[PDB]
Structure 1
């Protein structure tokens, strides 16, 4: 019986990392956990405050070109307010629409990776 407790982190492919940083931290409001050298380049690691699973903003996997990532869904406690905030902050939002699984919206980062919001029922 495996001792795996959770996903520590996964990777999002970006091109300009400084730009991605400011987007995920200032615009989307993630916490900046680490920004330092890593083995294949600059390790840039972000997460919603207090979450167990963080995201790494990388540029070193050929198999994941910048902006390729889809099907990422972020849980929020208030999808209307978050959409209002994003729009305020100069991001294009698609939604919020209702769905069988909660109230949802979509937007994209500066490379074109597509991020969902979901507030469950």
Structure 2
């Protein structure tokens, strides 16, 4: 009848130095470390905002996704101004916050240059 898909489980973020990316997403951005799993196929590094249904895999093994190539990623936050102040204190350049029709937004990049947005609806 209808599909049994509930949500996006995860998607991939292309990085170079995975240790550097781990420290960034976990320590600086504040995500939980869900898994850090070396194996035959590479190091599976998985992170998410605490309690979030959809997680991020910090991957270096997809040739069609060069490190730092990701754009158009937006994180929902309940306090964009406080998050921007924290990021700035933690050594991250933040563009914003700014008001938009869809919420108050800010932009920053990770160590490889992937572009990450924040939005407080």
Q: TM-score range by the shorter chain?
A: over 0.9
Mapped to 1, the partners of 2:3 and 2:26 lie a distance apart of 34
- Identify the residue that residue 3 of structure 2 maps to in structure 1: 2
- Deviation, structure 1 residue 39: 4.9
- Deviation, structure 1 residue 33: 0.4
- Note the residue ranges of structure 2 that are not aligned, 5 or more in a row: none
- Deviation, structure 1 residue 94: 0.1
Find the residue that maps to 1:95 and give its secondary structure.
strand
- Note the residue ranges of structure 1 that are not aligned, 5 or more in a row: none
Q: Larger deviation: 29-38 or 75-84?
A: 29-38
- Count of aligned residue pairs for this structure pair: 120
Find the residue that maps to 1:55 and give its secondary structure.
strand
Residues 32-56 of structure 1, C-alpha deviation per residue, up to 9 Å, x if partnerless?
0000124520000000000000000
Output the TM-score relative to the length of structure 2. 0.98
Residues 71-93 of structure 1, C-alpha deviation per residue, up to 9 Å, x if partnerless?
00000000000000000001000
Mapped to 2, the partners of 1:72 and 1:97 lie a distance apart of 16
- Identify the residue that residue 77 of structure 2 maps to in structure 1: 76
Q: Larger deviation: 19-28 or 32-41?
A: 32-41
